[PDB]
Each structure stands twice: as C-alpha cells, then as structure tokens.
Amino acid sequence: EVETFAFQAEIAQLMSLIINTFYSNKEIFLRELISNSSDALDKIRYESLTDPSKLDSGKELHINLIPNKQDRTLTIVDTGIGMTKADLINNAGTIAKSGTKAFMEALQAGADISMIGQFGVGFYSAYLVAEKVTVITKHNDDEQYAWESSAGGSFTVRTDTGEPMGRGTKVILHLKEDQTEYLEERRIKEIVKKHSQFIGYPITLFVEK
Amino acid sequence: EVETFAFQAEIAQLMSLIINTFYSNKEIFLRELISNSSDALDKIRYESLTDPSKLDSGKELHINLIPNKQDRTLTIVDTGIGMTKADLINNAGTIAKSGTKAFMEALQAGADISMIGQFGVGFYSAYLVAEKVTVITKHNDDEQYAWESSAGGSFTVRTDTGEPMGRGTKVILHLKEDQTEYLEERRIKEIVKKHSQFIGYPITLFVEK
C-alpha cells in the first residue's frame, strides 16, 4: 500500500529552485546528509543514556557511504535514531515551511545555496545531484518505511518489504546523468575530508567489487 | 538542598583550557549559546506538532538578550524545551566526553577555539567571557532547576526557589572584569548580526533603564 503526499508549495518551490538553478558547488549535499546522519546518531546515543534498551536494535553508531556505479546510486547509511512514519510526513511540515521561506528570502538577499543547513532544510540539497531520493528508515517505536520523491510536487510513503535494517536511515541518491563524479572514491574522500572532517562517528567509504 | 557534582576530568581540562588560553576572538560564546537556544526551540516546536499541549507552558518561541551593567551579567533567555535534572547532569556526561576529547585533539592538530560547536561542547565557550555561569531551566516533565559553575572542577544543581519561568532556559553569564564590552548594545548587535543573522526565532536585545 503506497501513500502519495503533496509537498507544501514553499517546499515544492524550494525543490524546483534546487533542481533548476545554475550552481556549480553541488558537493555540499554530502555534508548536509552526513550532518543529518550525525544528528540522528547523537539522538539515539543521548536516549540510550537514561534507557540502554534503546540500543537493542543495534549498538554500532556509524555512517557508511556506498557508491554503486552500476545502479548510479550513492547510498548514505546511518544507525541513528531513525524516523517514524509521522517524522517522514513532518519533514514536509511546519518547521520545514518557515525554514524554506527564510532560506528563499536569504537567497533573494544574496545568500548562497551552501547556507541551506542553517535553515534546517539541508536534506533538499540532495536534489542538486539526485533525480530521485529513496529513504529507508527504521525507528525503535515504528515499522520500517520507504520514503521516495523525484520532486515534481509529491512524495510517497510505503511500509518497506525489503531486508530489515535494525535501526537508522538509508538515503539512496539516484544520481543525475552528469553527476557520477560523486560515485568516485577520490571525489567522495575529498568532499568528506573538506566538509565532514570533525564528525564524531566513523564514516566508512565502501569500495566497489 | 544543593547537590555538588564533579565534572569528568576531560571536561574539567577543557574548561581550564578555555579560561587560561590566550584567545582574543571571545565573541564566539554568544553564537554558541544562541545556537543552543535555537536547537531547544526547534525541539519544543517539533514535539508540539504531534502534541499541542506541549505549549501549555508557553506558546511564544523566542530568545531574549538581557545585559545588566550593574550586576555585570549578560542573560540569554529562551522558551525552548528546557532541561530536566537528568539533562543538566548529562551535559557533563558521555556525549560531552567524546566531544571534549575530539575537540582538544583538534586543537592540538591546529584547529581553533571557534570550532568548539562542531564538537557539541559549544556551551563551554561561555567561560571565555564568564567567571561564573548560572543556568535556570524548566522542562515540561520536571521542576525548575538552577545549575551553576565557576569551573574549578565542579558544578551544583538545586531546585530553583525563584520566579517560575513557564518553560525554557535562562543563562546568566557573570562576566569577567575585562569582558564588559559584551554588556554594550552596539557590541551585542554587532555579534548577533555577524554570527546569528539566520536564527529562525526572534532575538530581542533588551535596553537598560
């Protein structure tokens, strides 16, 4: 059973701006997703202090970067707190609305796209490099869900029938044809070293066979 | 009834470094506390989506900057989620430990003190300008508490007997003798405009009588 939702107009407007604006510094999407993974890892780690059973779904706190040249996908995996079904829908809600409006106002006032994270809408920078984003997530208090959007004003949410992940979030970036540099080991390493050098969790870049 | 706690050694070491290192760019403490206020405001705002009764303790989501030249205090007030007694004690816990160690390692490797926030220990930059920090906080699920530390390896936690605050956190920076520039309106405005221009909550600088 697949549910389709409309993005609110300001978010749909933001997504179309990110897709259609000429902006060469596209590498910033990686920093934004890694930052969000690190925030989700902080959340589970903090909850696990007062309640250690929160880690029964997995004690390992890490980030994996998995490029796949055959599928043309860059997957970002984390074992953070994950997202509930309500969380997925709310990522296109009120906080995202005020943040989107403030960011687009800042862009009009001369700010640049790399400042997206300061408005809490950093996720949408995935659309600088991806024609489609698939998010697989599992929170301790809910089932495993698959969120997906190719922009165009909508996203879908379905219960995931795939392999269980224990806990966390998997971001599958279905890369645009001209954005395959983000599948190269040396390029990924360069971006991680430049923007995410101080992340408090092991970031593992997977090698392809 | 006042409870006294020891900071763990790495945090006590960090605090002594912040107090004794020659570092002229002290203004960064304001950005760190405002950033933490904004994060606490995001948390209550997000919780209020699925549960509107979370805002019965106050619907207003803001940050107030209150300098007081007579008391030599700069107070930062927010109506964020606030902190429980467990939260106050855990601010000197495991997450703070790994973050402190990583930050001090980065400093050895040539990083500078302004990067403190990337390690989640941004609060401790208050000790660049304050000889003592008093924190008054109220979370919906707990009583009102007063946290206090003049560094020296310890902090205290007591139930606050003062005026109720509804919900949020009040940071009272008892400024060092040579740090009174942070009580001047034009100086505060300059720092807010430079470092916190994109905060998603109204920041009000109070004028003195």
Ligand SMILES: CCCN(C)S(=O)(=O)c1cc(-c2n[nH]c(=O)n2-c2ccccc2F)c(O)cc1O
């Ligand atoms: C529908 C899009 C979801 N994303 C891919 S995301 O928001 O970039 C993103 C979200 C999470 C996430 N899991 N749990 C959680 O609380 N978060 C979270 C963290 C920071 C900010 C907002 C958030 F919800 C993550 O681990 C990685 C991500 O790349």
Ligand SMILES: CCCN(C)S(=O)(=O)c1cc(-c2n[nH]c(=O)n2-c2ccccc2F)c(O)cc1O
């Ligand atoms: C003992 C020191 C407490 N501080 C003064 S603080 O951490 O800088 C600080 C904390 C809060 C706070 N309230 N609720 C909450 O979750 N937080 C929080 C936000 C971000 C990071 C860690 C945190 F706990 C705040 O609103 C303002 C602050 O200046």
